[PDB]
Amino acid sequence: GAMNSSNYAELFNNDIKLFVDDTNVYRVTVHKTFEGNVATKAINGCIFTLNPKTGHLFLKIIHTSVWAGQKRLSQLAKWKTAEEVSALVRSLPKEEQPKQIIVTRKAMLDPLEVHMLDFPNIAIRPTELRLPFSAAMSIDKLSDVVMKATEPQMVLFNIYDDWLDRISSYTAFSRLTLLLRALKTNEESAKMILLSDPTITIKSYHLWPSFTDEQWITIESQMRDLILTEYGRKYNV
Amino acid sequence: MNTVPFTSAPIEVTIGIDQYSFNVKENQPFHGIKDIPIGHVHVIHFQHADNSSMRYGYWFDCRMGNFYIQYDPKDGLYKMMEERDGAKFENIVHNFKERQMMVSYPKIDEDDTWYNLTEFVQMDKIRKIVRKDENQFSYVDSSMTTVQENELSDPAHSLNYTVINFKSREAIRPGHEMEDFLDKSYYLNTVMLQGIFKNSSNYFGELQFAFLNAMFFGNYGSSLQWHAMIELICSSATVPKHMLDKLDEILYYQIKTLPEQYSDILLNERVWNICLYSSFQKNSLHNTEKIMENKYPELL
Numbered sequence A: 001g002a003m004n005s006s007n008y009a010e011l012f013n014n015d016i017k018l019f020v021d022d023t024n025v026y027r028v029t030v031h032k033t034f035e036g037n038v039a040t041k042a043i044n045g046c047i048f049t050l051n052p053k054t055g056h057l058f059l060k061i062i063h064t065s066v067w068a069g070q071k072r073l074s075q076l077a078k079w080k081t082a083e084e085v086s087a088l089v090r091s092l093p094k095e096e097q098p099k100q101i102i103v104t105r106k107a108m109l110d111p112l113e114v115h116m117l118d119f120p121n122i123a124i125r126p127t128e129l130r131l132p133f134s135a136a137m138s139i140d141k142l143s144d145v146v147m148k149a150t151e152p153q154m155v156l157f158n159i160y161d162d163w164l165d166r167i168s169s170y171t172a173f174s175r176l177t178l179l180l181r182a183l184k185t186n187e188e189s190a191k192m193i194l195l196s197d198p199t200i201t202i203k204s205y206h207l208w209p210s211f212t213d214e215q216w217i218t219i220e221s222q223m224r225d226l227i228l229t230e231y232g233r234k235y236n237v
Numbered sequence B: 001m002n003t004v005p006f007t008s009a010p011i012e013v014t015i016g017i018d019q020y021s022f023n024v025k026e027n028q029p030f031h032g033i034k035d036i037p038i039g040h041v042h043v044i045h046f047q048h049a050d051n052s053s054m055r056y057g058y059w060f061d062c063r064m065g066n067f068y069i070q071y072d073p074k075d076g077l078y079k080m081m082e083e084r085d086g087a088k089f090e091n092i093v094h095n096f097k098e099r100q101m102m103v104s105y106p107k108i109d110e111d112d113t114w115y116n117l118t119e120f121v122q123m124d125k126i127r128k129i130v131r132k133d134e135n136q137f138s139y140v141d142s143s144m145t146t147v148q149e150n151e152l153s154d155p156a157h158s159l160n161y162t163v164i165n166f167k168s169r170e171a172i173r174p175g176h177e178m179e180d181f182l183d184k185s186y187y188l189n190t191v192m193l194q195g196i197f198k199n200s201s202n203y204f205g206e207l208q209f210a211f212l213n214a215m216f217f218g219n220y221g222s223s224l225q226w227h228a229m230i231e232l233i234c235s236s237a238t239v240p241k242h243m244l245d246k247l248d249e250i251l252y253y254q255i256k257t258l259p260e261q262y263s264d265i266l267l268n269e270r271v272w273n274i275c276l277y278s279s280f281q282k283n284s285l286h287n288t289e290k291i292m293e294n295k296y297p298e299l300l
């Protein structure tokens, strides 16, 4: 059934599961044509497939060529997503295949269920959480590899860097969702928070800066301020 | 014209014969139904006055034998039986006909309703859906479940309708997932029509039989089957033109015959709105769409 606040610790148990987010698969710029009509131009996209217990992020880059000559692209994008997730699962050894796949949008349920009919034991589940994974393209290294791709490509990263050496997967996911929520609510402020201090760097093999434990507590507090703020600047409170 | 005699009527009961209904009081001198049209299947069905629970009845074709009804006080119901002694039967019917002990099948001459509801329904196919091979007639009641319902518990007493499931490997070709799910023509024309049913007459026969069990017995799994078979056609972009035209006629007469007060439980809002307003065949069911909009505009 649907994943929600009541069953949140299930994400960090020892049953392999993946979140799938399709919100950055089909991406466009909207513009005027010489005749003054409106047209779209697609740009590269990505499927965001994440193991919340381990931090493994299977980033499948969606190159614009996949849309050439196709109709009803927003509908095709859900099916292309389901096709690529099914191919990923089939590529994994049996003992690494997920036992559940949680989709962040309900419109992915039927496309994924149909593509996974060969796997009747894998549960396809929606969620009641409003997870901020659309903001993954505000992570500079992820945006960079998506935009530079000249062909379809899968890149493998850990979105927790080395955090699991010092914190649990519950705490790591909480930090991740806070960072992504902040970046989604005010990208510039969030990015200022994360980089203002030039002595804290991002390792070549990492996505986020190398904060000490004490600095993460400050950072995390600053992201909560931002989110409550913007919630005032937004609603005037 | 043929006859189904009754040994007696020991318990008060509403008896229906196809779309007709009448009341028989406890121990009333009732000895059956005469003038039944030859050439059609028929259904004779029952609802006891004391327990409106369980509607039940029997599908039969008088060309296949001499059938009668006899109440059983142990099992507590009116049972259909076959009389093999043809002389014994013709004499019995004649004596009762001579004494005016039977109600006449009241077929108005202009009226093609029953033909139009049973056009493709054959006894031999009924007997494969309702398995009880020692009898030439078939018992159905309100509570019987379908083979597919049992997949989601006595198999001998099941309705073995053809399983239709839009999210199944049978329905979806590897590598055509999106194509086959959004346009079900492959599943309709290759898997079901060419492969299982063999022709559209047999498909329409099962569809009509499922409707009639839903209407006369309130059989829920039959209602599911009727709607599934409609939706499979409406959700196919490529359907033979003669099938669409015939489907429109079939559904028109089903909607025309449905009791107005049962529409809330016998009609699935989602299926009908999809079929009439969103599907590939949204513009191909002119008669059905007109009667639906004038009779059940609330549903839509």
Ligand SMILES: Cc1cc(C(=O)N2CCN(C)CC2)cs1
Binding pocket: A055, A056, A057, A058, A156, A157, A158
């Ligand atoms: C399967 C995935 C692994 C990682 C990752 O960060 N590394 C963990 C250490 N080794 C064992 C594999 C590489 C991202 S996706």
Ligand SMILES: Cc1cc(C(=O)N2CCN(C)CC2)cs1
Binding pocket: B020, B021, B022, B023, B103, B104, B105, B106
């Ligand atoms: C074969 C038969 C049909 C009917 C019929 O239509 N009536 C049933 C009795 N009254 C109360 C309503 C109307 C009677 S005998």
